[PDB]
Ligand code: HEM
Ligand SMILES: *[C@@H]1O[C@H](CO)[C@@H](O[C@@H]2O[C@H](CO)[C@@H](O[C@@H]3O[C@H](CO)[C@@H](O)[C@H](O)[C@@H]3O)[C@H](O)[C@H]2NC(C)=O)[C@H](O)[C@H]1NC(C)=O
Ligand SMILES: *[C@@H]1O[C@H](CO)[C@@H](O[C@@H]2O[C@H](CO)[C@@H](O[C@H]3O[C@H](CO)[C@@H](O)[C@H](O)[C@@H]3O)[C@H](O)[C@H]2NC(C)=O)[C@H](O)[C@H]1NC(C)=O
Ligand SMILES: *[C@@H]1O[C@H](CO)[C@@H](O[C@@H]2O[C@H](CO)[C@@H](O[C@H]3O[C@H](CO)[C@@H](O)[C@H](O)[C@@H]3O)[C@H](O)[C@H]2NC(C)=O)[C@H](O)[C@H]1NC(C)=O
Ligand SMILES: *[C@@H]1O[C@H](CO)[C@@H](O[C@@H]2O[C@H](CO)[C@@H](O)[C@H](O)[C@H]2NC(C)=O)[C@H](O)[C@H]1NC(C)=O
């Protein structure tokens with residue numbers, strides 16, 4: 001097979017092995033195979049890639065060719081018939097907050113990214129894709145089926161570009177096509193600190209010896225910080241309201257400004273880096289800026305680890321967790337920490353948890369002003385609503401008080417995501433996230449629903465009656481097969497999502513498995529996982545056990561009323577208490593001494 005080590009990454013990183021700090025790139029975690037889990041390398045393959053030419057060409061590319069003796073259904077046709085719904089009433093999750101959706105997006109963004117193939121600088125390859133919908137090379141258009149209302153308004157297709165691949169980005173051929181993970185595979189708060197040594201520095205305040213991080217100079221949220229602006233024009237954030245002139249935020253992750261609430265938790269995280277950084281110079285005045293940045297970076301890492309695994313995961317995987325993520329037993333140097341290709345489609349389960357509206361509430365948890373409840377589609381790359389319409393305080397209260405959208409077989413993805421999505425480079429408010437997910441499955445060369453079913457050790461449904469038993473839904477299983485013709489061909493995203501949810505959790509049998517395995521691999525294969533003896537001192541761990549997302553809000557906002565359990569559905573005022581009832585993170589054990 002091979003090549004054994006293709007591609008060019010950040011080709012200049014040799015290990016210190018004696019440093020107690022993670023590399024920005026994620027290198028040097030593993031002593032034996034040191035590029036394992038790093039950034040800018042092939043997503044791991046749990047199962048062999050599936051292309052029609054067996055090498056690189058997606059299923060759906062050529063019209064004459066077929067998948068298992070059937071034509072693959074159009075990306076959007078799958079959506080129009082199965083994914084969409086009209087009536088938004090009763091789709092709310094009665095036992096999970098908007099934060100349950102929100103944190104999903106934070107971890108994931110920490111864990112993976114597969115950068116698009118917008119290669120070029122002054123180009124007509126972008127034009128022949130968008131204007132003419134000409135398939136070929138790095139352009140893979142999402143066509144519109146007969147009687148799509150988007151034909152009248154938008155055109156003949158939705159522009160779609162293939163994902164970036166290993167070795168170089170001009171076509172080529174040898175092994176099957178593997179897609180690139182632009183971020184580090186460890187749960188290491190890279191959304192904040194970056195995955196490139198080049199960018200990791202740009203985000204830092206290297207003007208003072210305090211290990212602080214660059215903050216906005218133009219705007220201020222009641223004396224509290226905002227992220228810096230991305231002064232790289234043209235920007236998507238400016239385009240949406242030209243009169244405002246407000247550009248996107250800049251963090252260690254490109255997707256920080258995609259939606260308004262994701263930029264909000266980005267503000268909270270950046271805020272507590274500086275708070276830890278400041279409290280550490282209170283306690284350790286002799287420390288240089290480097291120790292400060294790094295020591296703060298280490299606590300925040302541990303922060304995102306404890307919240308993800310103690311608070312988030314148990315309510316996602318549910319009864320299935322102990323089956324897949326048993327209790328911790330130490331760092332296994334034989335476990336592959338890399339994020340697999342399929343995982344980048346498993347974690348997308350959350351797209352069906354995004355509700356139609358984002359609300360802004362006041363101190364009394366009452367609707368804030370005339371335009372309190374906004375449509376979500378108006379909030380893609382919307383930063384002017386943060387900076388010039390209340391700050392983050394109203395949006396944070398919304399997260400804690402308002403419900404998440406519950407997954408439903410008859411009501412899947414909101415039309416605000418499935419019909420009105422804004423994509424950063426393009427101009428209109430009209431892409432389909434359901435269709436975009438469905439061709440990326442095909443682009444990445446995913447094997448079908450059944451391979452993955454079997455991979456996890458679950459009955460591989462082959463008949464109409466078979467699929468029924470698994471999906472516990474006769475009408476959905478029939479629509480699925482009328483389009484896919486066989487359950488072997490169902491795209492992993494929709495197939496995995498269609499399944500009913502496990503007990504006490506928010507995902508079904510197949511997804512619990514795929515998600516379950518990854519999260520254990522990235523816990524067990526991480527040399528810097530907080531609990532692993534050596535990383536944090538015995539005392540340091542005891543304080544880290546006390547962190548809560550509620551405390552992140554209290555110490556970095558002028559919200560004073562917070563629920564204790566921030567991922568479950570809480571009502572005002574009964575479930576809300578004072579910030580004083582919420583346990584503080586004691587940073588005393590970090591106090592190093594001299595004589
Ligand atoms: C309104 C909120 C959200 C918006 C607007 C949004 C939008 C997007 C878009 C446009 C993509 C690119 C898809 C592609 O081209 O393949 C994406 C990727 C992704 N999203 Fe979301 N998303 C949201 C929330 C979430 C949440 C809450 C989660 C997790 C629970 C999530 C999980 C993911 C994952 C895993 C990817 C692929 C990551 C990778 O690059 O490998 N998203 N999102
Ligand atoms: C483009 O961005 C600007 C903000 O930079 C938006 O303009 C603002 O629009 C609202 C009206 O919807 C104005 O608020 C008004 O004043 C007070 C609150 O400050 C309130 O009592 C009034 O009832 C009213 O809501 C605000 O002054 C105005 N800013 C100015 C002077 O430009 C604009 O709506 C955005 N448009 C788009 C295309 O989204
Ligand atoms: C809504 O979700 C809440 C968050 O999980 C959940 O709170 C959970 O309540 C039970 C208390 O019993 C705990 O789960 C345990 O339940 C039984 C024990 O009687 C066992 O079978 C389970 O294995 C499990 O240990 C959770 O600890 C607790 N969650 C947390 C972390 O606070 C509510 O119960 C849910 N509300 C509804 C709709 O019932
Ligand atoms: C990099 O770090 C610098 C030092 O920590 C920081 O400069 C400080 O900025 C704050 C906030 O803008 C200023 O605090 C306040 O100054 C007066 C107080 O009398 C107020 O009237 C202002 O409203 C302001 O809030 C400090 O004056 C300033 N400190 C120093 C040492 O000059 C930079 O802003 C940081 N730069 C970046 C890009 O992150
Ligand atoms: C560390 O984890 C690895 C991977 O799960 C374990 O390696 C397995 O060892 C079994 C024997 O029990 C072998 O049959 C397999 O070859 C290994 N499995 C895999 C997935 O490769 C190992 O048991 C663990 N080691 C320690 C010390 O905990």
Ligand SMILES: [Ca+2]
Pocket residue numbers: 110111112183184185186187188189190
């Ligand atoms: Ca990471």
